[PDB]
């Protein structure tokens, strides 16, 4: 029985092959019928292509030595394939799902090593398909060769897999022979769907013709974990990743920074550096006791440091619920620290200085009295995040009856939202401080509303965009109607079918409004 | 006796003065005398103005309606006197000088909440200026403006202290009267200079013709600490600050990210985001035993894979001693990866492949066997450092005698490059894991050397440079004379009366050196 699948890069896992750009040259150029690829292969095992993919020389040393076997621009030509070659996206799916069902998955290919003015392209497509596999294996790091018998016995050492558990693709006849002959099961890729139907026909997994795949999560170990003190008793705690324009997530209530699991990578990929925050009285953020801890000032104050202290003089900010309310505030108050602003469910309504704020909101007041909901909340916290984290359908939800678990199961069934996993990453992360410090978000109505006031006269002008989700029965679509007359050039989203928990809910949908948005207003 | 110094922003600590522009517009246009200047401050404390300096309205809402009271742009305008505002050197090193020497300083402006297109120039200035500073109060964050008394009484409430221990700096004789009539020493700035005389004379402090001060260094519990885990029992700790290209900066033995504290706000000043490398077996980072897993293919693959958990495709790697041998195996195993490379004293000079490594390098020898160096180098933290880090001059340091501090006092003399305080931050970095890892760096000369010769005939072909320090006696500048047969487009800077211990022996002039570099051949 099959446990590994092992893939090539040019021609199977990334699309069109860098070797059918020679031939393509030809016909254009109309030159005669295989003379770049001639050029290309000439002297066999001792010639130059052979040194460069063994790692003898890199491929700036390597052009000149191309334009002699030739003997235009091999340079441009080489520039051109290279940025138009883009990753095999049916391919890395079933990559991904043999994976997800067990394999040990593999690249091996004939690479060289790339010091071109504009090697980054390249080195940002190997970054995307590499996460996705156990192992990468490069020609030009090993200084060995497809289709040379030794590069095989390697693949399965490193493997530690006999030959007849491995499925080994390649779109080259030649590479593909020494596999088959150690016993491998071979698959030669012309077109991707009837390499896909061999595939899926000797693995037994279903991966032509599969569901939409949800966007790729985050592994809390695999991440870069930051850690800002804002102030003496104060740190926070973020992750990390990419490059680009700083762009700072913010939770709601009680949530994590792995509530945008899957806003992150995609975010990183779409040429972003994501600052993912535990936002003050969560996982590994500091959690002070007092209520005044957790005003909105503080709370803006304290950001504004963490950006004064990483060296950021801007971010975007991208707030959900509580973190969506603190991402308007930011705007209101910090400008010129803010280069766009984004929320996801939390509508801007402005203060009414006329009335008090305590004058679908029973869940504030039952919030109110220090102690009881976190009582509540922290008896059984496996129960109180399968309770909380559910779809609009799954609904298992007053204050009166004495409690916000009232009539709800003891031990609820898994949302289709969330794996078992996650909610103890969840349960894990509030065992070190538990509701204290999220509760003290919503016991500043009060203060909130006092400083709020000092903004009555102002408008929102930077770049802006509000989304709404359709069945949030808290923060419903409708709150957000008027806010057009404070922030006039206010952009919009909408997501249908969608509950309070946007980003698990709706992942795919939630990146779709959000990468379009940053790059058309936020650079 | 004073002991607070209170500036303002506008014609004091930054210049040309914002004010200076409405003038020079309305010669430049021929416009009527104070034309621009009157429409600006009309309505006195009932006007637009007097709003948008309170935090009432924003800077985008306040453009309409000044122009309306000078019925060009008035935007365009601002936008200009903004950019062309810069900070006043002079007046910040003063500021810098007398906090140092004790002050509490802080800087009181009347400004205003900035929404515009291009509000970064702003931000990034208040960023660079308030780091410097106890405080920074601003009138529109305050609700309260200058002249009027509030904001007097708030400023001594900040400074916890009496109207008679505070120098008060303004360029508006009307700010300055209610600082006097409360009992402050105030200086009405017009020319720095003789603002600075006035200064010095009430201070006692020389602040003029003063010696040039040494860069902006780190204290580490301001940083923002990174934390990424590269294989299950290895983690690397870094230190961050600032945004745009990625810079990584690699230390020598026995060393720290501390080693670099004169270059990180620099390089962050100058664009860049600097990432400190606590290299493994130093720091923060981890220690393992093993000396294989010291061998510079590990180091260098561990590396890769730190850019690859950040989400960075690549970095420019800059080296210091062992660091800079690492940065130039980077350059030619993984170019992909290295946006450019840079060495401080290290030279590349490439492995002789007929004769063995092994066969001023008595240090190497007395390092090879485990334990031995470890016994001495740990036996007195403090004695360690104070003799290895010294300038040229101050020399205090073979194998055979049987020791590296043979004939070393057992109390040296603080070198002038650094303070008891830096010395104790490496006594601390030092005691968690010894220097068992940092020897293990020495401990890998027969497969360092393997490893190397598969690159023999490679060249390094991305942008390059390599930095010589006159008085280094292990690295020295003659060493690196052949560099450009393997790195023909090879950048060079070279620093004079400069020891081993560059980053702190020569720290202005590596930054001038660095930061050139970056700006031409980095991005
Ligand atoms: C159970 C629950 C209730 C409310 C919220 N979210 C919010 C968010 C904001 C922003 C609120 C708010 O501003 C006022 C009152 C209640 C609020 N509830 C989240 C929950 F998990
Ligand atoms: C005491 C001492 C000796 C040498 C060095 N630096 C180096 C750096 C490199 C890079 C070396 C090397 O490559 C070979 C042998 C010795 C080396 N010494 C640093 C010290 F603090």
Known sequence: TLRAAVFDLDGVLALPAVFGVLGRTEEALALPRGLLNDAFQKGGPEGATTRLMKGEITLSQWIPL?????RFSIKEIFDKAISARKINRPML???????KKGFTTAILTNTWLDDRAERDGLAQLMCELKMHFDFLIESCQVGMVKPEPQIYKFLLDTLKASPSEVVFLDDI??????????????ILVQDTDTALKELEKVTGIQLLNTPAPLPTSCNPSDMSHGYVTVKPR?????????????????????????S??????????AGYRVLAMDMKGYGESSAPPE??????????????????????????????????????????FYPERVRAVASLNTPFI?????????EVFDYQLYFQEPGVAEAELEQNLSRTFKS???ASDESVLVCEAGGLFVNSPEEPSLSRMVTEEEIQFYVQQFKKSGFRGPLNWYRNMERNWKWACKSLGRKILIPALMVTAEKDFVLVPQMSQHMEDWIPHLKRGHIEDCGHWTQMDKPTEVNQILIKWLDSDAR
Chains 1, 2 share one sequence.
Not at 235 to 243: A, C, D, K
Not at 260 to 267: E, G, H, K, N, T
Not at 309 to 314: E, I, N, T
Request: with cysteine; glycine share 8%; charged share 15%.
């Open 350 to 358: 402005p203060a009414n200085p006329n009335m008090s704020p305590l």
């Open 388 to 390: 909380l984290f559910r």
């Open 291 to 332: 209520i005044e801890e957790y005003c909105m000032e503080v709370l803006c104050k304290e950001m504004v440091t963490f950006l004064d202290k990483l060296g950021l003089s801007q971010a975007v900010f991208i707030g959900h619920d509580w973190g969506g309310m603190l991402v308007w505030y930011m705007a209101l």
């Open 66 to 70: 191309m334009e002699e076997n030739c």
């Open 234 to 258: 104060v740190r926070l705690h973020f992750v990390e990743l990419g490059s680009g324009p700083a762009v700072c997530l913010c939770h709601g209530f009680p949530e994590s920074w792995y």
């Open 93 to 99: 799916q079933a990559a991904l799902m043999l994976r």
């Open 173 to 186: 006849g030649a590479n593909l022979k020494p596999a088959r002959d150690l016993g491998m099961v071979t």
């Open 260 to 269: 945008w699991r899957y806003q992150i990578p995609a975010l990183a990929q």
